[PDB]
Amino acid sequence: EGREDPQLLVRVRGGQLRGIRLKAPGGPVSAFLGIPFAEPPVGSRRFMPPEPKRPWSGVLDATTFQNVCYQYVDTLYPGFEGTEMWNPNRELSEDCLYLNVWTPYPRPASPTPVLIWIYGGGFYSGAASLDVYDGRFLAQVEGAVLVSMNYRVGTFGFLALPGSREAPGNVGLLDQRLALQWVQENIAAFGGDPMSVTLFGESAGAASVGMHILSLPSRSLFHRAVLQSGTPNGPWATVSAGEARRRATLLARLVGCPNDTELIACLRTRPAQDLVDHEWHVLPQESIFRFSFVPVVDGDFLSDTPEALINTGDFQDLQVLVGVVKDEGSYFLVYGVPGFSKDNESLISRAQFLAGVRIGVPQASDLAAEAVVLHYTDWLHPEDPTHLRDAMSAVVGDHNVVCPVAQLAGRLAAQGARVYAYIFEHRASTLTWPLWMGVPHGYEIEFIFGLPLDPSLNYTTEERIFAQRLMKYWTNFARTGDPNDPRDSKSPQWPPYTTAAQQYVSLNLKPLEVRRGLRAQTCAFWNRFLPKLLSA
Amino acid sequence: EDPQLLVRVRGGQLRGIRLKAPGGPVSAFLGIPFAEPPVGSRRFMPPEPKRPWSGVLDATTFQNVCYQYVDTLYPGFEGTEMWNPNRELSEDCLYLNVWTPYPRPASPTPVLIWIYGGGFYSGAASLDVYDGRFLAQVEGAVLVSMNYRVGTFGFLALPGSREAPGNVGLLDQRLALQWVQENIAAFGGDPMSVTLFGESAGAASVGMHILSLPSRSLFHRAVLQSGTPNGPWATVSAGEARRRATLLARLVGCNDTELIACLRTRPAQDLVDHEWHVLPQESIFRFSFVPVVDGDFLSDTPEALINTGDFQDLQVLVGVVKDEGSYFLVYGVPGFSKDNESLISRAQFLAGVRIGVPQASDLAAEAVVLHYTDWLHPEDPTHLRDAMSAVVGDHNVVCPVAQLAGRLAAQGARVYAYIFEHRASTLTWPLWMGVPHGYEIEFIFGLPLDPSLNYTTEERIFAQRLMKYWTNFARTGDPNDPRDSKSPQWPPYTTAAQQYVSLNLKPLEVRRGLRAQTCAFWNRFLPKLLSA
Ligand SMILES: CCN(CC)CCNS(=O)(=O)Cc1ccc(C(F)(F)F)cc1
Ligand SMILES: CCN(CC)CCNS(=O)(=O)Cc1ccc(C(F)(F)F)cc1
Ligand SMILES: *[C@@H]1O[C@H](CO)[C@@H](O)[C@H](O)[C@H]1NC(C)=O
Ligand SMILES: *[C@@H]1O[C@H](CO)[C@@H](O)[C@H](O)[C@H]1NC(C)=O
């Protein structure tokens, strides 16, 4: 080894690693990027459960981010920062089952609580190596050990012919579980506490956290959970066995593959791009906020539908943090609903609102669509282009995030879980999306991870204090199961979400303000009445 | 012999009586016959014009109230007795009353005709809350009220028969309107400025004169207080009227002609005994014998006619009170009473919705319960009590009033809409019932001006304000004082801005949208639901 930094060499079960000494604004951090945790799921292993990574010889260099899992790449606004910030930033490859580890430098003295990040992106996209997921600040400022993994997305992650051995589905979720098993065995070599491990994720990542809560094998790999703008329940996170099967055989036919063994075998002989190129063509209706290849209700990972499982499972000794941004829906309108764009004020007509309701609520019958249209329209001003636009954003945001989270928060709480609920209401001063989109899906994240602390990034001073505050909320919750400061008593307190009072806090530049009722009236509509109306 | 009290009408001569109102005398002519007594074989039949009479007919006393069911639930309680008959019950009841300033107007004076309510099942014009002296003495109006047949006697129909063709109760009102046309000028009334105004079933009847072309030549303005021709309770189909007619006939021991004959040969109370037993469901705010869609008086359904008529030369004043439904809960809904606070459970609230909305399917009462629950306090006894009253009030008055106002304003009419929010200081109902169905009436008729009625000074001032709105409406079509130059004016209800005003002790305040989101639920979505 000779003349290396002796704080950057670490042994794990698979072999030796050499990490990197990164500069964060307020000190150095240790990072170990690109650690292989499964065998490359390539060739005859495509669509299959990850096998644990065979040990390697010598010191593995762990100083670069590894390849992004093969995925669709957004082409709507080329060069626009607001979309590129989510696109992959390393080479696309099916060999992509790697994870990353940030820790204080030097590595800590006492065993430190671990935070595991699961990125979002609709189960069709995402990478643990994007800039908004950079753990250098949570490590340096809060002392935390942060772990983020790559997991297979798209067809490679979730294409299922249920019941079969060569494509049993949910293998993307099995990637994440394997990374969690990896943390249990290895994170103490870095100073992490394998007995204090908190999952947290956004969008499909938040959804995934939910599925590890509900899948009994994952339950012994973590102890607390944070779900940001996403849920295992709801209309997009899961599909029936039947629908997954229909979506898989359609894609097979679309690439020329017509007994499931012979069909998957053919799929395994196709370039990764040919699958990506046809992935969006298997959706049943014209939709937004719908993704072709997502977790399946397999009767295995998910013993039953998430709706059934949250309704009837025991959840004491489980601490959860859940929340939403203010305008969950706005982002999705520009990827489908005619009339909407990032370059226009998107002032739409009544006609277009009704057309958009059928796209944002694609599974809805004619009557249920009318019901949605009746609820959201302002009958004092039923033709105002501005109320209609913002109403269209709210249909999509309520139906896909806010009311599922409301359903999850109330059903967990009724079943003994300590729940904490927020709404994130601050719009980044640096946002490049138009004002009409408000605080869109995903723009909490740069503040949880603490990017405002980077002087070069041009956030306001208050934005930097704000980001520090939510970093302490998230980390306090990872440490204690309670986002509140023990020492800071004078500060306004964050109370648990109860079925009786339904308290939640607002996250913005002002101090915490407590509110009652997660869009209670409107989510009674989506969570109670609407199921009974398509039940007839 | 006071010549002011001698009037010659087309049917002979009358003597009225001079009454004291607080600020002066009034000429009243009570008990004037306008039709042949619909007794014996003329039962269920259209009314016939009264034959002329000899000598000078005495019209100083109130004539009998039409035969009707009498309420029993709170015996001798002022809140209920005040609506109960205050003269003898008779089928010989087709008489009307005229009040006129003393001395009689020197110029043709606008006429106000009052059509009482009582669910098409009860009511009379001799009730003290319809006392016409105040409006005649203070605003100088000529005020007319008539009796019309109620219950089986007014509205039992075997449609398309000739012995019981339906709606004779409305043909009673119609004939009174024609009597006013032929005769009112003799009292100083202006037959060319006649405003109908009524409440509950009366407001509904006023609506049916708007929609029945033969009635249009007998009035020029209308006021519909807390009642409409559209909606769930004011009409039945011919199929359904025939059902209850033949059901009542089965129940009292009785081909159409023979069936209606037997019914004629039956003491009155024998028919009223079974009046309530022909409703198809357990109900509240539902009545056994109401106007029928006959293809005659009502060419189509009221919902179809408002959706399609031409109303350009029409001016209308429509409104509701704060707590329409609350009155009806004590009359059928388990858990509710005038004598406790009627705090109810969630299950009791589910059960009440199937009676407040008796026609609704499982899915539709589900929909109603989910809408009216306060999902922040879904089990709170007080929110459920207040929501049950709102369900009943919105389903039956507020939302029909909002649908009629919308259709009228859109199709050429001039609409002025109110919400009456003041609770009488003398009210004898419990505090939780708010301002119930029917308790604006005492203030429009000016009763607080009677000092022995122990109303508060501001309530006297408030009643005089309302009397001006109504009489100004009669003279002009516009309830706004043409002298008051002060800013808050009552604006016309429009489809675009949906403005209405609030009537209470504080000055007029203008609000937009008359329970807009909730009536979109009732008028737009719920129809789509049941019919699927
Ligand atoms: C804003 C942060 N999120 C969550 C991490 C990432 C963006 N993907 S998204 O959320 O799921 C919204 C979206 C849907 C469909 C398309 C495409 F590619 F089909 F056009 C792009 C983006
Ligand atoms: C307060 C103003 N109104 C009309 C002027 C008086 C009561 N009739 S009402 O509105 O229709 C309410 C009511 C319904 C049914 C019953 C009974 F008798 F059948 F039980 C009594 C009272
Ligand atoms: C905004 O732009 C989109 C796409 O170019 C277009 O379809 C829409 O109609 C425009 N709307 C307005 C209000 O300019
Ligand atoms: C931040 O602001 C400086 C000017 O002070 C500018 O030169 C730089 O390019 C900006 N960077 C970003 C990422 O906006």
Curated annotation (Swiss-Prot), chain B:
Organ and tissue specificity: Predominates in most expressing tissues except erythrocytes where a glycophospholipid-attached form of ACHE predominates.
Chief localisation class: other
Keyword Glycoprotein among UniProt keywords: yes
Any one annotated GO CC term: extracellular space
The keyword Hydrolase belongs to this UniProt entry's keyword annotation: yes
Reactions performed catalytically: acetylcholine + H2O = choline + acetate + H(+)
Organism of derivation: Mus musculus
Complex formation: Isoform H generates GPI-anchored dimers; disulfide linked. Isoform T generates multiple structures, ranging from monomers and dimers to collagen-tailed and hydrophobic-tailed forms, in which catalytic tetramers are associated with anchoring proteins that attach them to the basal lamina or to cell membranes. In the collagen-tailed forms, isoform T subunits are associated with a specific collagen, COLQ, which triggers the formation of isoform T tetramers, from monomers and dimers. Interacts with PRIMA1.
Top-level enzyme category: hydrolase
Active-site feature positions: S200 (acyl-ester intermediate), E324 (charge relay system), H437 (charge relay system)
Glycosylation sites: N255, N340, N454
MF terms (GO), sorted A to Z: acetylcholine binding; acetylcholinesterase activity; collagen binding; identical protein binding; laminin binding; protein homodimerization activity; serine hydrolase activity
Subcellular location: Synapse; Secreted; Cell membrane
Topology in membrane: Peripheral membrane protein
SS bond list: C66-C93, C254-C262, C399-C519
Keywords, alphabetical: Cell membrane, Disulfide bond, Glycoprotein, GPI-anchor, Hydrolase, Lipoprotein, Membrane, Neurotransmitter degradation, Secreted, Serine esterase, Signal, Synapse
EC number: 3.1.1.7
Family that this chain belongs to: Belongs to the type-B carboxylesterase/lipase family.
Other comments on record: Synapses usually contain asymmetric molecules of cholinesterase, with a collagen-like part disulfide-bonded to the catalytic part. A different, globular type of cholinesterase occurs on the outer surfaces of cell membranes, including those of erythrocytes. This is the catalytic subunit of an asymmetric or soluble form of ACHE.
GO term, biological process aspect, one: receptor internalization
Known function: Terminates signal transduction at the neuromuscular junction by rapid hydrolysis of the acetylcholine released into the synaptic cleft.
Name of protein: Acetylcholinesterase
